[PDB]
Amino acid sequence: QTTTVYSLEDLLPYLKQDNVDVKLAPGTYNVNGFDVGEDRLFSTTPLFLFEGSNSTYDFTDVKLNINTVVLTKFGNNEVNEIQILGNNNVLKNLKLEDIGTTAPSNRAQSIVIDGRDNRIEGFHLTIRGSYPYGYGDAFGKGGGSVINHRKHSGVLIRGLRNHLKDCTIISRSYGHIVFMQAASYPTVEGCYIEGEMRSTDDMLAEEGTGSPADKVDFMTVWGYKLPAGYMMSLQEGGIRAFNAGTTYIDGVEIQRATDNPTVLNCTIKNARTGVTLAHANGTKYVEGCTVLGCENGYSIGSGTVVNCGADAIYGPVFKNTYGSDKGYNADITILPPSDAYYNGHDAVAYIGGSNHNLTFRSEITEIPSNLKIMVSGDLQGLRVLHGSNPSQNNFAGTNIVLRNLTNFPVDLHSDSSNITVTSCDTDNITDNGTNNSIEAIDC
């Protein structure tokens, strides 16, 4: 049943066939600038367009090196390396590495999964080449940027019941690592997702160099000069859902929010957020994950976070996105620090909205003096100072169960009401809220 091919050129015709079982032979395959052109291997982007359905593709022991210059060979258009348009396909075990750091002419995605019921399993992906690289999103991640960007994201999950499984995604690029747009029932399972960090102090130390940030006097898109004391990811979201997007299934173009996402047993390291699903609709479920050194741990809006952990070294482990947030059920372990604390947010959690049931567990005994569990109040988040992003800060919390099985202090702001707080220690619970209940329990 298995057709084996021994070159990228012989591979490409099968991508237009339904019901094929193909194996690309073990080996190293290189895509460079000379391979893009009208009589060259790749005349169009996406480079690898899986239009067929009901197919399987075996890339075991395949090292695919794509020179980032390919990102500039298709004019001012988005460049996708891999896109799946058909249904019921299985791609497995490919090792795919971006070579060099050349920025896209426009923007790039390594993998776009449209269609329905597809699965990508066992991939090892390394993402490079973007602009600017060094500032995270401080100078713009969308329209109206202070420094114009050429983003390069990793895996874009769209379509229906599409599945990312047992993948390793390393990004050294300014973009999302794994993200979901218009995806219905996407599942990310068993993946290791990793970016890298840089302090805002190191950014501000470009003063006087003529860097792009230096030439705008570090004025961020948030309305104020980049503040010292924060650790930022050079990437965007580790796993981030969007409330918009376009996808294609069965020849139908679809525009809709992501809905019913599921994330299971993922480890997320050094991204802007660990798991953020607050902007998807439907049922959100997160179980068994580990978030290390992200600016933000878990933000799913509503739904279930269970058997999950995050450290607090660079930002809070938990944050309610808006005052609308309702029904956020979470059980989160605050993990031992994976590096030295550098958390300018002055919070381990920011809680608001209503009708939440929240449990925090930890073995940490060394509590940094600036870290507390906040219910309502004015979070000192990098992106929400001085009225920036106003719906994402300074909001009320009501009818919340807070089980603080940790040593972290709790600060109940005056906009909090009907918070039912159980804690290891009550002496470090300040309550300026209304009709809040504080009871002690035995460690």
Author numbering: 1 to 443
What do the authors of the reporting publication say about this deposited model?
FdlA from Flavobacterium sp. SA-0082 is an endo-type fucoidan-degrading enzyme that cleaves the sulfated fuco-glucuronomannan (SFGM) through a lytic mechanism. We show that the FdlA-NTD adopts a right-handed parallel β-helix fold, and possesses a substrate binding site composed of a long groove and a unique alkaline pocket. Our structural, biochemical, and enzymological analyses strongly suggest that FdlA-NTD utilizes catalytic residues different from other β-helix polysaccharide lyases, potentially representing a novel polysaccharide lyase family. Here, we report crystal structures and enzymological characterization of wild type (WT) and eight single mutants of the catalytic N-terminal domain (NTD) of FdlA, revealing its unique substrate binding pocket and identifying the key catalytic residues.
We first measured the enzymatic activity of 12 mutants and found that eight of them (D137A, K141A, H176A, F179A, E236A, R240A, Y242A, and Y242F) almost completely abolished their activities, H279A mutant retained approximately 65% of the activity compared with WT, while mutations of Asn243, Arg272, and Tyr322 to Ala only negligibly affect their activities. However, the Y242F mutant, which also lost its catalytic activity, possesses a potential active site nearly identical to the wild-type form. This result highlighted the importance of the hydroxyl group of the Tyr242 side chain. In our docking models of FdlA-NTD with fuco-oligasaccharide, the hydroxyl group of Tyr242 side chain is located within a hydrogen bond distance with the glycosidic O atom between −1 and +1 subsites, thus allowing Tyr242 to donate a proton to glycosidic O atom and function as a catalytic acid. This suggestion was supported by a previous report showing that a conserved tyrosine residue in β-helix PL31 family members serves as the Brønsted acid. The hydroxyl group of the Tyr242 side chain is directed to the glycosidic oxygen of the scissile bond where it may function as a Brønsted acid to break the glycosidic bond between −1 and +1 subsites, generating a 4,5-unsaturated sugar at the new non-reducing end of the product. While it remains considerably challenging to unambiguously identify residues responsible for proton abstraction and transfer without structures of FdlA-NTD in complex with substrates or products, we were able to infer from our crystal structures and docking models that Tyr242 and Lys141 serve as the potential Brønsted acid and base, respectively.
